[PDB]
Subunit: 494 residues, 2 copies
């Protein structure tokens, strides 16, 4: 092989693509166009009110501010990597000499969008959606040979005896629909839903996992880490294939700048969650310092944490302590992350590298695990947080049940509903339908129209795309919007 | 005579970097600035102060707006630097090793451009000033001591024969009635949050150069830079040191500011229109017609009509994508060109115009967006009601804390020192409710004073009022509203 980043940092687009030879400048302007597209997308503002950890009530992080923090850390790691590469006289050799700006920016924006796909109430929205679609589709009963009391409630998707091609499609659909995941939904959102038409490189930095959502069974040994969670849905399959071709990815391989983004997320996530914890008066700073000292056991802790504490004891103490905790943490981990990226650059470039930059038995990872431990033991277990998670789960389950009658309809009927807009014998599901976002309905019409109308696959694909539509609509909501819809449609408030 | 090494100053007020530095070490310093800002509570507090509409999610907040402005500022900065490189002027102006810093300072100046604003924005302003006017009446201190001086504070009332003390009284009364977002921003970044930014960075926040205590007309040659107050009587010393570190003449301004300002103008106009359509006030076609009518190969044809033609994904999104893109592709180059064309004056910090404020077609496009906005959006009864409400809320909080300002020096001082005073239950608890940061700022400032001087009661009262304004202006919309409701015993 060889490391030529010109072959990875691909400034083409899916639609209306830039063509031909380009100035270093023209390339830069393209990736800046990407920045504009993202910073101005509704998806991002929607982040400015999805909950991070605490109920919104102002100084507490939201998905947005967290994403901005991650962006900053990503920038710092990218800059350290590029700078070390310049000191190693390796920048030209790796084809990065005219792509430093793009490199940096792709990382920054990949960070900003790392949460773009998450549904309201985060991992509990996820939980709610998957659990609901599991109770309706039971993918576990499609694992092997057709079960004679197949628990799935959808006639079309139930495994029928003798028709193994159709049965395989049924299998994939049922598994896929029960594996909604923030990142996969993120790819879907950026491409099919918002139609942002980013550069291939930029979309690549969003693809954080490489397992198909419809995946059943164990993951390959050699790819365990990159396939921890679903990375793309059955729908984006074609798209993801083209993406692989444009970014020179082997199957289940990942874009490199992703590894960078990931590391940034880990760092920011840990430290910030602790600071917010102190801000919500859960524990004082001293209490935090003791929990850390105890949960640990010239070492790293001494440097980062104990020096942060000593600085803190000689502006406001909470702010001083956390300023220097952040600073010291970053000054230890960011160089390490950079060093790991470079040391492992062949594998990371290939996109096959089966570890995180930080996931280790290295002291650095242990520091991160320390923050995460204190967080999960003394913050995420707090009754107000837990209550909010419970509530969110009820709200999303509730909405899904409210729109159930859209998924109850036969192909004939639902299609009639799409075409006539307002159906006389179907008042409720007509109005339920109108309540779906035009963006999402459009995506449905678009996807269904591209189908072989007479093929036996059609009812299956249609049902899939219809469920896909409903999940699009729900996952697209902010916490407050989802909660509010739930309350109004339950006729609890006007 | 343009040496940007003399403006892009990487020193700090406290614990400053000293000596010779690598281009890299300089970069790392300005990145440290970025970190300090992006992680400051002030910025998240922006993620819920209202921009135009009530929070209810797709609508802009002070934060998202600030991010949009940041992007436009970055683009303008890059265009300026790039045009300077094409003119072979980059080395000559001392920017060849400061391109990263240049860009970054602009970006962050943008992100912080709203950091100072009080809850409910210009109506919080209104409320604060109007309240302190009813209490201090600066208009009665304009000239010679008035014998029925309407001011209700014994110490600050103009007394006959004592013209030095009278001048101090004059400045204090005028200053306290001229609370302004930007001045409060300087105060916030420096005295309150103690962020200790670089001088250059603080400089990009200083948008106006008129002292808050200014009375009478502004100089002819500086009319534009002194439209609004830029710094309070307290930050006076600080601002002086800032002038020395950034090589500013009196009432002169930092350059990168002009850039930030232009970014604000652009993204503010376009965005407000988009959000207007999102809140279903008018459709896209309705908007296009309001624009076409309110106008009159020209610019409109290019930017707006081409946006509309492209528009005919979702139509609202397509139209606004290309409206934003075309607008930027016209105005950002122009802004850059204006910055460079006028670089001597802008560098000096004396340039008496905005990059965009003109009779130039570009400014007219902006004025067009602003006109359609102010006529068909800001006049919408729901916006107006929110402004009215906000003014009531801030006026209400100020009245609620009034008894802290009613106390004598002796008594209020006793309150500060003993923390809980037995004969003063209410004002004790009111006092405890003030943020420790703000109270600390008060103690800090008062302790530095000549304890026996006749100026002391005056300065103390000033700093006390300063304290209360710090606390109120520091709130988010929702927090201020909520405090007003709870302290009125309307909700538990
Ligand atoms: Ni995250
Ligand atoms: Ni603004």
């Amino acid at each position: 092989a060889q490391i030529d980043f010109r072959k990875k940092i691909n400034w083409h687009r899916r639609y209306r693509s830039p063509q031909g030879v380009k100035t270093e400048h023209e390339i830069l302007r393209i990736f800046e166009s990407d920045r504009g597209r993202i910073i101005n997308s509704p998806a991002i503002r929607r982040l400015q009110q999805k909950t991070q950890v605490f109920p919104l009530e102002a100084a507490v992080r939201t998905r947005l501010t967290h994403s901005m923090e991650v962006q900053q850390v990503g920038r710092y790691i990218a800059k350290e990597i590029l700078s070390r590469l310049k000191e190693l006289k390796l920048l030209e050799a790796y084809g990065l000499d005219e792509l430093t700006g793009p490199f940096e920016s792709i990382v920054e924006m990949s960070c900003l969008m790392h949460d773009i796909g998450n549904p309201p109430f985060g991992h509990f929205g996820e939980a709610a959606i998957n659990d609901w679609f599991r109770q309706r589709l039971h993918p576990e009963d499609a694992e092997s040979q057709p079960l004679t009391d197949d628990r799935c409630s959808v006639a079309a998707l139930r495994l029928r005896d003798g028709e193994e091609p159709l049965n395989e499609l049924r299998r994939k659909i049922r598994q896929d629909l029960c594996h909604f995941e923030g990142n996969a939904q993120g790819i879907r959102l950026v491409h099919t839903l918002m139609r942002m038409n980013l550069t291939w490189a930029q979309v690549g930095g969003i693809l954080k996992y490489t397992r198909p959502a419809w995946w059943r069974g164990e993951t390959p040994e050699t790819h365990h880490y990159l396939m921890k969670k679903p990375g793309y849905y059955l729908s984006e399959e074609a798209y993801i294939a083209r993406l692989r071709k444009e970014l020179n990815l082997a199957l289940y391989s990942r874009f490199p700048l992703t590894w960078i983004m990931e590391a940034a997320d880990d760092i920011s996530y840990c430290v910030a969650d602790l600071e917010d914890a102190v801000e919500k008066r859960i524990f004082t700073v001293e209490q935090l310092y003791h929990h850390l000292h105890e949960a640990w056991g010239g070492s790293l802790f001494s440097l980062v944490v104990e020096n942060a504490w000593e600085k803190s004891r000689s502006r406001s103490t909470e702010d001083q302590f956390f300023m220097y905790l952040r600073v010291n943490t970053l000054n230890k981990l960011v160089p390490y992350a950079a060093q790991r990226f470079i040391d492992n650059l062949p594998a990371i470039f290939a996109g096959t590298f089966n570890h995180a930059l930080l996931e280790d038995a290295s002291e650095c990872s242990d520091l991160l695990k320390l923050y995460k431990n204190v967080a999960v033991k003394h913050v995420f277990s707090h009754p107000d947080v837990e209550r909010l998670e419970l509530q969110g789960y009820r709200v999303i389950s509730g909405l899904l049940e409210i729109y159930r009658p859209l998924l109850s309809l036969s192909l004939s009927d639902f299609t009639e509903l799409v075409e006539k807009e307002r159906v006389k014998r179907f008042p409720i599901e007509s109005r339920l339908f109108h309540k779906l976002s035009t963006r999402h309905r459009l995506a449905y019409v678009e996807a269904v129209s591209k189908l072989p109308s007479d093929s036996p696959e059609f009812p299956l694909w249609e049902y899939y795309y219809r469920c896909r539509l409903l999940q699009d609509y729900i996952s697209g909501m902010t916490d407050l919007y989802a909660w509010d819809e739930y309350r109004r449609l339950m006729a609890v408030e006007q």
